[PDB]
Design a protein around this nucleic acid. Structure first.
Length: 194
RNA sequence: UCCGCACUAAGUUCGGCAUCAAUAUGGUGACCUCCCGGGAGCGGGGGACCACCAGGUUGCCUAAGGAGGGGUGAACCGGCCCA
């Protein structure tokens, strides 16, 4: 139904090491959270000695929790990419795996976006996921030095964030304004690089 | 505050399975094919295909696929230096 992806990710990253710049602990926590969610809802991927490719269909979205699985997959991919960003200063080889991982991060984001097109999901989650996917696509295109698509995605995501902030009270719009302030320097730097 | 309770929500600890590919250059090891010379052992030069290591741009790649570290390397079947 209705979910607050931004609130969940903000409450998760600010309390699991990322508040001071720690990515190993956040990645470990995300992996443990994914494992616990898989065990809790009986979402086993492969049995003993065998593996089967699972899929999140619209029929099983009635639990209002399978969104968190794909969200945590995307968050883990993003954390891995930003972790390799730190170690890419002295290891030039890490960049290829960094980009190969963020390319799958955008795939996870677009999967979580496309699974929300059904009527079982309210209008808030769809718009929030669209903003998240736009931000992720912009980050991906910026990291590959593609400026036009990155700035287009950044414009879309900031427009959605501003509309969402205007839709609510000023007490709760602070987080959306913070996200806008976080993404503005990237847009300005990309424009300056041109 | 007590519960052999129910599920949701985070961590301790121990096992099992699996852990990618293309492109440019150079190198090693098998095998194949063109030559020049020589009274032998052979010497010099050019290519086709496979495996691997280091290492630069990448992906119609996955739930992921480190350019990580170690050991065995066997019966004579990885070669090197070979009494």
């Amino acid at each position: 139904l209705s979910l607050e992806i931004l609130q969940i990710i903000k409450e998760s990253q600010q309390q699991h090491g990322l508040r001071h710049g720690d990515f190993q602990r956040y990645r470990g926590y995300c992996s443990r959270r994914q494992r616990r969610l898989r065990k809790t809802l009986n979402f086993k991927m492969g049995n003993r000695h065998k593996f089967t490719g699972k899929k999140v269909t619209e029929d099983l979205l009635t639990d209002n929790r399978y969104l968190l699985l794909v969200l945590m997959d995307a968050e883990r991919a993003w954390s891995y990419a930003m972790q390799l960003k730190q170690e890419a200063n002295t290891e030039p080889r890490k960049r290829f795996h960094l980009l190969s991982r963020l390319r799958k991060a955008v795939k996870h984001a677009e999967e979580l976006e496309r699974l929300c097109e059904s009527n079982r999901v309210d209008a808030k989650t769809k718009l929030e996921a669209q903003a998240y996917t736009a931000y992720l696509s912009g980050m991906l295109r910026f990291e590959h030095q593609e400026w036009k698509a990155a700035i287009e995605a950044f414009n879309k995501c900031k427009t959605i964030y501003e509309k969402l902030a205007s839709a609510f009270t000023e007490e709760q719009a602070v987080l959306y304004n913070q996200r806008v302030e976080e993404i503005s320097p990237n847009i300005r730097y990309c424009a300056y690089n041109i």
